[PDB]
Amino acid sequence: GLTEEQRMMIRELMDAQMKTFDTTFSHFKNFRLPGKWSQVRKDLCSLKVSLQLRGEDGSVWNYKPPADSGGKEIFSLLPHMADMSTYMFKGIISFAKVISYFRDLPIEDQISLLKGAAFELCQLRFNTVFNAETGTWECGRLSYCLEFQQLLLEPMLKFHYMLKKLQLHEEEYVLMQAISLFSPDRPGVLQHRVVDQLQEQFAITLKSYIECNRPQPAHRFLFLKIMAMLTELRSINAQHTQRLLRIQDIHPFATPLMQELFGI
């Protein structure tokens, strides 16, 4: 069964998540909206989605993006998306700051862990508003709807659908976020021991929490189907840091906060 320590660890996680996650994005506003190596900088074709705003008043605005052609007109969705990253990243920074195990680390190590994990916890805070029947991320009054339902050739997508299929609980979707924020192997971490011991506690609690609350055959090898997911999320996260730095190197759009995160 679960111990008192584990129960208190999940409760601090769940608490921090409640307090710092706006699942309806009420406080997301005043954000922008669409009015050589380039070769590759057509990295934007992979992250292309149609966007929908409802008002409230009953209105609907819908944006359908263009087609890679000529050159520009594809950046037409780099300012708003950056606004969304910034809204997200701040929720993720508040999440970390309000966990005692995190506030206890030295400042320089908090900054290391945030820069390693911000993406990963976003993409997780995002799987839970993902709708895999319609392929869309329901962000409150905002929708980002995916434009062959077999092009999960896109890592990110192939990872959103897989994750979704697991039907994790809020306690899961939370512990996976601890496990990923506390990675000892992140550039610039000093207290590599403490952090490794912390991760190790978060894992064993996830594993107990599953063997305690999921006896069904569908849930077998789950804890591991989950750990491998995280290992994968680390890779997608590298591939996109890189992709994102390319776009930025030729068409600067990162907010200050994203500059801090990526050390620009």
Ligand SMILES: C[C@H](Sc1nc(N)cc(Cl)n1)c1cc2ccoc2cn1
């Ligand atoms: C906002 C980013 S895309 C993005 N595009 C850029 N050009 C730069 C940056 Cl920094 N981010 C995003 C949005 C959603 C919505 C659902 O899942 C998501 C995962 N990531």
